[PDB]
Amino acid sequence: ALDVITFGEAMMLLVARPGPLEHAEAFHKRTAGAETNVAIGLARLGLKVGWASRLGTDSMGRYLLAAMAAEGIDCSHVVCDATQKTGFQFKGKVTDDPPVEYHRKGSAASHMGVADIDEAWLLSARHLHATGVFPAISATTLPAARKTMDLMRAAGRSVSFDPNLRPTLWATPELMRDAINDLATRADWVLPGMEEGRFLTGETTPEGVARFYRQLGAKLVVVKLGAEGAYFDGEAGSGRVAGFPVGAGDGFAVGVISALLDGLGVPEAVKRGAWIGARAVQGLPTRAELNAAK
C-alpha cells in the first residue's frame, strides 16, 4: 500500500535581515521538522510516504498540512485537533549557523502516544523510518516510538533508525544515551554519524560504532564519516564508500532508504546517500536530478 511511514513533529519556521530576533521587522515562512525532511526527500523521489503526527486547527497547522500534501505525502494520519496547538520556531539571518529559537513545549505532536498508533495502517507500509527526534519530544512519545518499531519488526517490515541527537529535548545526556541505544535495539538499519557514535558507544572507530550496533541486533549499520564518505557493516559484509567534494544527514538518510527500497545494493545505496548528503548541504532532489547525475 505504501513504501515508508514516519512519525514526527513539523513546525512552522519563521525566518527573519540579520541581527537579533527581537529587532527583525519581517519573517518568511518555511517548514521545519526532522522526520518530515526525510518524508519530503522520499516523496520527491517518487516513493509513497505517509506521515503520522498531530496539529492544531489553526493557521500554522493548516499551512503545514498543505505544504506536506503538496510534496506528495499521505497526511491521512495527521490528526488535526482544535484543542491543541502547532509548534513554530524562529531563525535569524546568518552572514558568517543561525541560532534557532523553538516554541514547541506542549504542542499537539508532544501529546502523541501509543494510543495514536493505527496498527493496521502502520503495517500497510514496507518500511518505517525512525529518528531520535520524535522519541525525544515528550514523556508520551518515547513509548510511542518504541511500539512503532516493535510492531513493525514483528510484522517482518523494514525498520530504519537514525540516532539523531538533540540534547535540548532530553533531561540528561545519560538519559538520551540510554533511550537512543535502547531504540537501536529495535532497528534493522542504523545510520549513525561518527561523532554521535563516539558519544553513544565510546568507540573511536567506524568499525567500532558498527560492531556495537550489530551486537544490539541490526542487519545493517552505515556510519557517516563526512568528507571521507561512509563506512558500512552488513550481513553481506563491510567496506567504505568515497563520498563527495562540497541537512547532510537527512539527505544521506533519503539516499540509503530510497535505494535499499528500489532494490539496490548496499554500496550503491550508500553512494546515493553520499550524493544527496553532499548535494543538499547547498534542495532535496527529484528522480529527474537523481538520474541525471549518473
Q: How far apart are CA 190 and CA 200, in angstroms?
A: 13
In angstroms, rounded to a whole number, what is the distance separating the alpha carbons of residues 185 and 173? 19
Report the alpha-carbon distance of residue 69 to residue 71 in Å, rounded.
5
Binding test (CB under 8 A) with a copy of itself, winner from 1, 18, 29, 265:
29
The site partner of 34 among a copy of itself, Cl ion, none (C-beta below 5 to 8 Å per kind) is Cl ion
Q: Per the structure block, which three cell numbers stand in for 66?
A: 498543505
Label residues 28-67 b or e (16+ Cβ within 10 Å = b): eeebbbbbbbbbbbbbbbebbbbbbbbbbbeebbebbbeb
Which is nearer to a copy of itself, 100 or 264 (by Cβ)?
100
Cα–Cα distance, 63 to 57 (Å, whole number): 10
Burial letters 186-219, b for 16+ CB under 10 A, else e: bbbbbbbbbebbebbbebeebeebbebbbebebb
Task: Name residues contacting a copy of itself, limited to 97-156 (CB under 8 A).
Answer: 101, 103, 105
Residue 25's binding partner out of Cl ion, a copy of itself, none, with CB under 5 to 8 Å set by partner kind:
a copy of itself
Q: Spot the catalytic one: 116, 162, 233, 250.
A: 250
Nearer to a copy of itself, 61 or 273 (CB): 61
> Nearest CA to 133 among 86, 64, 76, 180?
180
Q: Which is nearer to Cl ion, 5 or 133 (CB)?
A: 133
Q: Looking at residues 243 to 272 of the shown chain, list those that interact with a copy of itself (rule: CB under 8 A).
A: none
Q: Minimum distance from CB of 244 to Cl ion (Å)?
A: 25
Pairing state between β 229-234 and 237-241: antiparallel
Comparing CB distances to Cl ion, the nearer of 14 and 34 is 34
E strand or H helix at 55, and its extent? Answer: strand 49-55
Smallest gap from Cβ 232 to a copy of itself, in A, equals 40
Shortest Cβ 7–Cl ion spacing (Å): 13
- Locate cell 539571518: which residue? 93
Choice from 1, 59, 143, 182 touching a copy of itself (CB under 8 A): 59
Size of the site for a copy of itself (CB under 8 A): 22
In the complex, the smallest distance separating the C-beta of residue 204 from Cl ion, rounded to whole angstroms, is: 28
Q: Is 229 in the site for Cl ion (CB under 5 A)?
A: no
Candidates 2, 46, 63, 117: give the one binding a copy of itself (CB under 8 A): 63
Q: Which residues contact 122 (CB under 8 A, 6 or more apart)?
A: 5, 128, 148, 151, 152
29 binds, among a copy of itself, Cl ion, none (CB under 5 to 8 A by kind): a copy of itself
Catalytic annotation on 182? Answer: no
| Touching Cl ion, residues 249-268 (CB under 5 A) | none
Nearer to Cl ion (CB atom), residue 116 or residue 250: 250
Q: Which is nearer to a copy of itself, 64 or 144 (CB)?
A: 64
Taking residues 7 to 36 in sequence order and writing x for each that binds Cl ion by CB under 5 A, - otherwise, the string is --------------------------xx--
Residues 6+ apart with CB under 8 A from 34: 8, 131, 133, 134, 164, 250
Positions in the binding site for a copy of itself (CB under 8 A): 14, 20-29, 58-60, 62-63, 66, 85, 90, 101, 103, 105
Residues with active-site annotation: 250
